[PDB]
């Protein structure tokens, strides 16, 4: 299937409290594998996945130098944007970037990314054609014109189609065995009620990975979607995820409802119902 290598970078100014906080996180197939955090005496990129410990000292040195370079570049950008937006030097502002490549099974680039945000809002982004830019406001038009003249789009395309794809292959080779990890969900239904003629049936999905999953409630036929409570998928904190979906049903009719769990790791969707303990 498809794979991706993207870096999520953040710079947060802290006027009157020190230098901007700079953090760069690298992800392979949406899994963190390297991290750089300026919050240290001698900041350096660090492995966040065991399979990365394979990279030698020259790799870590090179990436660290590049991160510190980007850090100082973001420091300058923060000041630059204060000018573009005519803002005070006393407030805290944030710049974020998502940079990377998504490649298909054939090894060809499916989509390249190079998007920026200022204070949580889109600023500028490289279009799918990897040739033009989309500026979100007037301040970004300045950067756009600047990057159009500098041929920045061509520089990024070279990285996205070359270096990014190449390193992605390299990382996949070393971590493939780990990245393919799959933990099917273990489900069960709980029964809850307050002194009333209705009851809540809650369908739980636990210990699964990846996080993508679907839970549905069925009444004999048809899918109950209009009145089903659902929580956002959440980390258990040990590498697996959790999720639940609940429905309110008539007291005594619990056996008419069925919960279905859909996961990519399931040879076949799970079907279960409330089972009162012995």
């Amino acid at each position: 299937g498809p794979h991706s290598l993207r870096y999520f970078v953040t710079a947060v100014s802290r006027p009157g409290l020190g230098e901007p906080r700079f953090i760069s996180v690298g992800y392979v197939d949406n899994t963190e594998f390297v991290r750089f955090d300026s919050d240290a005496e001698n900041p350096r990129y660090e492995p966040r996945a065991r399979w990365m410990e394979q990279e030698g000292p020259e790799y870590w040195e090179r990436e660290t130098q590049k991160a510190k370079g980007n850090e100082q570049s973001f420091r300058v950008d923060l000041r630059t944007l204060l000018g573009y937006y005519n803002q005070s030097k006393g407030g805290s502002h944030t710049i974020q970037v998502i940079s990377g490549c998504e490649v298909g099974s054939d090894g060809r680039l499916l989509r390249g990314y190079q998007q920026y945000a200022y204070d949580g809002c889109d600023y500028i982004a490289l279009n799918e054609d990897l040739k033009t830019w989309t500026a979100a406001d007037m301040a970004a038009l300045i950067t756009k014109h600047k990057w159009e003249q500098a041929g920045e789009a061509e520089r990024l395309r070279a990285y996205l189609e070359g270096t990014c794809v190449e390193w992605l292959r390299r990382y996949l080779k070393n971590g493939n065995a780990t990245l393919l990890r799959t933990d099917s969900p273990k489900a069960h239904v709980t029964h809850h009620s307050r002194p009333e003629d209705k009851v809540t049936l809650r369908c739980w999905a636990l210990g699964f990975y990846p996080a993508d999953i679907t839970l549905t409630w069925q009444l004999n036929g048809e899918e109950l979607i209009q009145d089903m409570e659902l929580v956002e998928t959440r980390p258990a904190g040990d590498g697996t995820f959790q999720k639940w979906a609940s429905v309110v049903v008539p007291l005594g009719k619990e056996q008419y409802y069925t919960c279905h769990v859909y996961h990519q790791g399931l040879p076949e969707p799970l079907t279960l119902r409330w089972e009162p303990p012995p």
């Binding site: 870096y7 990436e63 590049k66 980007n70 970037v97 940079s99 600023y123 270096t163 390193w167």
Partner: peptide, 8 residues
Amino acid sequence: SSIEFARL
């Protein structure tokens, strides 16, 4: 491997 960013 990350890219070296340009200035805004």
